[PDB]
Amino acid sequence: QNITEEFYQSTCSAVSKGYLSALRTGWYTSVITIELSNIGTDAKVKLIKQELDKYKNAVTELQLLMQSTPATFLGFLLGVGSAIASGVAVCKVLHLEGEVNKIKSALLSTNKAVVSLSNGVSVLTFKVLDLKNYIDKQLLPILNISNIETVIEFQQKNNRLLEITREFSVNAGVTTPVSTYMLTNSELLSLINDMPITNDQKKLMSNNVQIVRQQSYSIMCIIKEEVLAYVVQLPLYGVIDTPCWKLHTSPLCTTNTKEGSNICLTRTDRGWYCDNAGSVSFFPQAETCKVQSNRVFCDTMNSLTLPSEVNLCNVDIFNPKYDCKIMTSKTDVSSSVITSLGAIVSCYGKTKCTASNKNRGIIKTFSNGCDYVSNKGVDTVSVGNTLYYVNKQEGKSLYVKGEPIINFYDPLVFPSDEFDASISQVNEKINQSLAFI
Amino acid sequence: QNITEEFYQSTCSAVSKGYLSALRTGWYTSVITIELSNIGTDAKVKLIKQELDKYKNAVTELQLLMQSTPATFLGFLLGVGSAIASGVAVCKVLHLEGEVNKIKSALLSTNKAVVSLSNGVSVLTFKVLDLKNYIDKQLLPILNISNIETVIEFQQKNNRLLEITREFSVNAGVTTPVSTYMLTNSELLSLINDMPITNDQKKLMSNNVQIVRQQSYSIMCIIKEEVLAYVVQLPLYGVIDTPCWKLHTSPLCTTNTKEGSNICLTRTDRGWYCDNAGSVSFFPQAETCKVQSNRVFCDTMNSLTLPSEVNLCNVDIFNPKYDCKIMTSKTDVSSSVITSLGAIVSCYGKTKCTASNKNRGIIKTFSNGCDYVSNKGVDTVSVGNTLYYVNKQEGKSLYVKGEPIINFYDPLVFPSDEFDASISQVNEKINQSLAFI
Amino acid sequence: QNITEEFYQSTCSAVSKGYLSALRTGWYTSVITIELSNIGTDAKVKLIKQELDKYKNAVTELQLLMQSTPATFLGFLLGVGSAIASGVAVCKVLHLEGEVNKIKSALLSTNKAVVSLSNGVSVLTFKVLDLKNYIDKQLLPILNISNIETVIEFQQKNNRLLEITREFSVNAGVTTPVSTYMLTNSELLSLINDMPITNDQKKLMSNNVQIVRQQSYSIMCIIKEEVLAYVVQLPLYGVIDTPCWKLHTSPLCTTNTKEGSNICLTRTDRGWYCDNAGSVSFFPQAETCKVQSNRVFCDTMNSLTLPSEVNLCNVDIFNPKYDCKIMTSKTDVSSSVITSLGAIVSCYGKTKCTASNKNRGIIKTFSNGCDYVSNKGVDTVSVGNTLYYVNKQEGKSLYVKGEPIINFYDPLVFPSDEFDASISQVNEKINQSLAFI
Lengths: 437, 437, 437
Ligand SMILES: O=c1n(Cc2nc3nc(Cl)ccc3n2CCCC(F)(F)F)c2cnccc2n1C1CC1
Ligand SMILES: *[C@@H]1O[C@H](CO[C@@H]2O[C@@H](C)[C@@H](O)[C@@H](O)[C@@H]2O)[C@@H](O)[C@H](O)[C@H]1NC(C)=O
Ligand SMILES: *[C@@H]1O[C@H](CO[C@@H]2O[C@@H](C)[C@@H](O)[C@@H](O)[C@@H]2O)[C@@H](O)[C@H](O)[C@H]1NC(C)=O
Ligand SMILES: *[C@@H]1O[C@H](CO[C@@H]2O[C@@H](C)[C@@H](O)[C@@H](O)[C@@H]2O)[C@@H](O)[C@H](O)[C@H]1NC(C)=O
Ligand SMILES: [Cl-]
Ligand SMILES: [Cl-]
Ligand SMILES: [Cl-]
Hints:
homotrimer, alpha+beta, 13-stranded mixed beta sheet, four-stranded antiparallel beta sheet, elongated, binds ligand R0J, binds a molecule of 2 linked components (NAG-FUC), binds chloride ion
């Protein structure tokens, strides 16, 4: 869509809007299964027995791995979830008596089946590999007369089990993202199609398979009665196509000559924001979200739920309805923030700060303060010894002029070195130390 | 074992106990080796020469990689170690004159051998792959008459070297966890059995191979005199089966109507705790520890060693023997902490906070404040737009009633925005600003 | 070279010097290409058709993956770049009309070619795999008469495409480090040789291929007109062979008997420092830099550019030219920092702190305070329940005696719990609270 951006000279911040949400709100747990086989020398046979040893070792390795129950600025404000708690709950259910054999018979004549579990969970079940049938029908007649083509074919069919076992071996039975060995592209797509979700969610997931993989978990579960089972925990996107915007912030300092006499302020509420259920889902670690064109994929486990009035901080940081969060300091170091459609430059001290085009070099020299340049005609920005490439996605930027709010503060009573602060908190500290003077 | 949990309404925190320790306290270094070979066209031979090129390229790649010496709330309180310093020391010893050939002759007639190094280190040595013998006896007669079965067999035997070389290529010669290509499951188990440790440590490591892999390092060391050698650094668990407990904390705020008039406090001493040598090993980043049933695997490199009196903060946060660490703020945002056996809910402002069961939906609505619900009969908790699944492991929870200690503070003199603080420090700041008023 | 180290008893810090810089300052973007093929049963043929299905699935998988534009103490002071912004810009250029076919014809008769793009970018282009030619000439005659040797050969040639597709599938089309499947060791070396850089940079990159891989990105770009193209973003080292030094800091506390009466101070400016263009590039997260012998590889994106006067803080922390950054607290916990050539020990309270040799055990017991021991004759240091191995690289340490500056502060007016502070800031807070007393 149309991505747009606004820079607020008054608060050294920029908002990128036009994005659409895809928030993981829940989990769908499926049970993926591989059916196992209970079981002089020719050259072609010696390799078959070598591959068969790799197969038993993989089985006993996975059995040995399952002796234990499976487990695994404003970010510090986040709660603490247990991401695979739902999959582990389902996996705990697979250990009950004859619960495994319910699945075994469900998939006797199909590869995809839905099974109600004894506690009422309605899971999709998938037999992705019948090694039982291959080994019993093609390999067992030889062991109880070899060609080279079955050796090739066995290695191919056994390779998937060996790779699944490798992933679980270096990841303590819990992997993310979910590899194509756990679930092939076609398997996952068909799993998505049979999922109980909207046509909207099916289209979204099918068109973003790579993101679904990254937000999914594979939990090695049980080996019992010739059945290898691991739970695949898939994301549920209960919030879709709501407006999202990214808030970029950078430090705003006074620019006095006498070094150390300068005071700084930085909006700490940077990150992603998406409208969600009458509130705003705020993701302080914008690293958690994944952007595909204009679609933002986030996990609500790494969000706060804030009043929508938090959006007022962008137009009016002194608004009376929400207490905008800032941090203060006297550390006027130079840096840049690359935004969606431009660049914020916090230039202080003796630092060289410029913006350049690929064919003509420097086109703007910044002066001390916080400033901004859009990515039209600009390819790179330099702050000191650091070169930043700007994003070259298209979209209009708007420079909103306004006086830097740091000018409104008397440095002699300014409370520096406050991190978890806000506009009101800084006011009340000022008007206390003012009371003594 | 029996995991139990206690929630302290007074301080918005919960302790999970019943766990048993397995703390990595040291390192065991082994030297793993692969013996190398110094060395019209038929179809079967062209593939043999293609595989042989892959083998030389892997050798020269590993030689090119070794031109350099190998290298690689309260977390900020931690020291700073050098994790592979012991392996690198051993690897430095392998570069001495004829030191490589000591190993070469030790493993002439065995694959597992113990070798005393020239500085006195007593290392286990392992020849996991004799490519020398394979190439010289099966491949060299052909090059200096091809069947397809050796082409298959050569690719299999060479694959391990190619995979080891890949891992070292994308990891600058130092890998963790240690893959099954570095050390197969059977190789590691037998390596563990020949280790100089207790039957307790051998059983523990053999039953938790996947955890040993994650706490181990593979350090590519030397290629010299037809010997490829890399050091595998294995964990030593010098602390085993001592009591451990997990401390979960969440913010505790007043719940006044007038927004911004509320003060908050959070216990910052959350993480894992294990009794250890008359003190308490405290792991502030509980992400560092790995839980297998009731066994907690931690690394003492990411611990502080604290007086055992730190445990008093759970029963009496005002105790006179240890100065319990808290942080203060006015940031009353809502969130939840999922514990071992329940959930802490810090619910403030206008946030919807509930606890639900899978079959009947909402069963508890939280009111403003810090509260808790056990995982019996509860499957999920919701705070705002965030759904948390609770862990469904069994164990008894105890709700310990008590007045939230935040009520004991006058907001007008409460020192907010203190992170590295404590009960005594907040008292002494209060009684200073009180002195002026 | 000669690594040396100095410990400053007065400020509980140590500097390691003698290192040489290799700073990534820029990016070189190359376009790697793979030429694709538009396309009863014998046993040997059934496997060929199985491998051919793996090939189509890989193609449609990569097409499905590209529906979206590709994307991906003092660290908080850093700016925020967009690391693959330059590669994505080039990739955006490959989507223009007939721009793909410019590359297609450039590499018609060569595998390495330089192509000027329509916006003026001069990129190197590389055809690493002609699957088009293999499938059309060897496989198509069979499908439109099988031996086992082509089945083997096809699987080998198709394996690279399958592995590239796997990496892009679990990494949303953007990978780092760049694997040997993206770019083999010989391909990368030859790519480096044809790069437009100095003989100095070519030697440096060729001798540190593993570091180049870790600082590189592979960006899946386009599949169009039988051409698979992904951009490889290689580092440009515009700063080479300038002096670097590592600053290690640890907490400095008073050591009074009465617990809680102690005040602490820690230099927060720890990390790597390299001379760069008349300033100093400061890398606060020393984890970002990679050390190969005496060569330090860093990324200027994770640096601040500071006045070179920052170096004065090591000899004179009260110097009048630069305001040295410290943090304050009353949290006198014990810990150690392992340096390049020794160990800093911050020992407080009741903690056992010692230094040991492998053959003789304890050789030094530290007393309360901040102290240091060089790695000559010392193999391990113990602080509480934590054993640290010291680095055993050779080089001389110098112990610079001086009174711990924490003694210069009256605890009754000492401002504790200041994180983003400095020497001057602590002075001005003291002389304010002093004014009231
Ligand atoms: O380390 C922390 N501190 C010390 C501190 N105090 C500061 N003061 C100023 Cl002016 C500027 C930065 C400051 N920091 C560091 C910034 C932290 C971050 F990197 F996550 F952003 C915290 C202060 N309050 C709340 C949470 C805090 N955490 C986080 C959880 C460990
Ligand atoms: C609370 O304080 C506010 C601070 O604004 C200005 O900034 C500080 C750093 C000093 O310059 C201070 O003297 C200035 O006034 C005031 O604007 C505000 O009016 C005060 N509110 C009340 C109710 O007194
Ligand atoms: C030190 O201060 C303590 C603070 O307790 C209470 O909380 C603060 C926020 C205010 O309400 C304060 O007025 C209250 O007293 C005291 O409880 C304690 O007794 C004081 N100690 C001494 C020795 O004065
Ligand atoms: C500013 O304050 C400095 C502080 O030095 C000492 O440390 C503190 C904790 C107290 O002990 C204080 O009384 C001490 O003086 C002074 O050294 C410095 O001279 C002061 N500067 C001015 C201009 O007053
Ligand atoms: Cl960049
Ligand atoms: Cl969850
Ligand atoms: Cl160590």
